[PDB]
């Protein structure tokens, strides 16, 4: 459940990490790695 009224189901680790607002910056770096795994390969965004 995001901040606004939109609801979304997500099995993809990239979209899970993207919608989750993390306070810690080092844990936030994993959002960019999944974005990098999604942009380059497009498969195994949670395995990385």
């Amino acid at each position: 459940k995001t901040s606004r009224g939109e609801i979304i189901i997500s099995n993809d680790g990239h979209t899970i990490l993207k919608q989750m607002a993390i306070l810690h910056p080092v844990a936030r770096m994993l959002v960019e790695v999944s974005a990098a795994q999604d942009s380059e390969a497009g498969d195994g965004t949670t395995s990385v």
């Binding site: 459940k1 189901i9 607002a21 993390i22």
Partner: protein, 550 residues
Amino acid sequence: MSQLFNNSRSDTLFLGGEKISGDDIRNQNVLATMAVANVVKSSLGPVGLDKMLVDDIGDFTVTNDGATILSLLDVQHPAGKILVELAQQQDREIGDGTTSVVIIASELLKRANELVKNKIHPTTIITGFRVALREAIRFINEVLSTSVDTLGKETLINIAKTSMSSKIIGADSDFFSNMVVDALLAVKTQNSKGEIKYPVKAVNVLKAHGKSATESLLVPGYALNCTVASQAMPKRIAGGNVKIACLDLNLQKARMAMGVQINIDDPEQLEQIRKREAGIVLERVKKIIDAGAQVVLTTKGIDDLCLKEFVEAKIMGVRRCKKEDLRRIARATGATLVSSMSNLEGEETFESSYLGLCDEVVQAKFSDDECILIKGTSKHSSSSIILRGANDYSLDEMERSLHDSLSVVKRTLESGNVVPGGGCVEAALNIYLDNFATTVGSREQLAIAEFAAALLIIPKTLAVNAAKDSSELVAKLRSYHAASQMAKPEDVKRRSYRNYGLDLIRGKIVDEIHAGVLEPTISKVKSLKSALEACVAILRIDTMITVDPE
């Protein structure tokens, strides 16, 4: 059922709401489903009773439909919004089984959560439902029955009584079943080179509280709710072959376009400019008056400058209206809806081919209301429904009830195959799936067995709404059905059982063919699939994450 709220965790810091995991989520999702399932559980079937919901301004809505009662219940929980939008998807597509599909999904999430606690994975549970549903649709094809050796429109009458029931007008189903069937046969058309289709919301509904629901008059033709432009016009046009002119052109003191700024040096031009600016509209109305349009129809209103000639020429005027109702008037009367009058040549004109044809037109008074009743259309027939009741809230209940009744008979004529009702489908699919997967064995026998028990909630829900002994009927239903499925092909009597079951009025086992309980096959098709996808969406959820609003 959840108590002792989850502790705020210091090792996992996420902005917004706190994260919670474990079995409490699927317990909370099922608990959110019971909050909406118990609401719709009581208003199921003829014996079922409905509730009221106020709008916080004095207004309220007494609702029988599952889509309407859930539309006003704005569910803040995420899992409940899936079932709320499913009913909005259900009523728009099929218009039937809106209460059952929510009740089926609630019972599935109940037993699915129990199976997850029994330590089988949800992926195996979902595979058990899909292989079971694929055999269920295969079994629905086996129990079809083609209408044959039926006198007249009896198959369309008695099947409408099933949809007409569970409402206030079920007692008057003997009177409304005829006009409902006659209404859809009046709006028949052709499309896609021979494929028979009927338009959505083609029949009108007019709210006229008054005499009674028994004396609802079926006007064989189109009806429109509009006030007369000028009260001096005649309210009854005599003589046949009344020409109807449908337009969407304004007849007022028209203004020039935005990018025109008049600038003149001569003072005397104001006389001609002021007259020509008004007189340019007279050229449009002088041509249609000479054409003999006895009753003109238009979307945009008509100012008093042009209402003089209609009063002098005895022409009926029409004020603002919806854009969609004039399309069907043109189709029935044979006219053509003109967005802007013009011609391919270099001069404006008005042809006679654009005029419609009807036998009679009259402004009938429904005890406070001006409504132009058109009857005896030439090109294509039409129909309208005059709803009557005690008060406006009952008329609103009669609107959506007829919309469900019209939708059921609409899909009935699309496919001649039908299926019986009254829990016989759910009772037969229960015993059929229990026999299935006995050869499979190892793991999916328990998942499909609980799936077969989930469909039995509908004959249990209908029984307790009657305030009678429920297990006495369940003992007769399942046992009779089983004795039919097991039987030799060659046994007339036993085979027949496959056909009948629960009765909610007299409380005994009687034949559905003589009783008249019947449903379409399309109502059950794609209903369990929607409930299946509804179960899959919540059952696969493990953890819940909430972000607070900014």
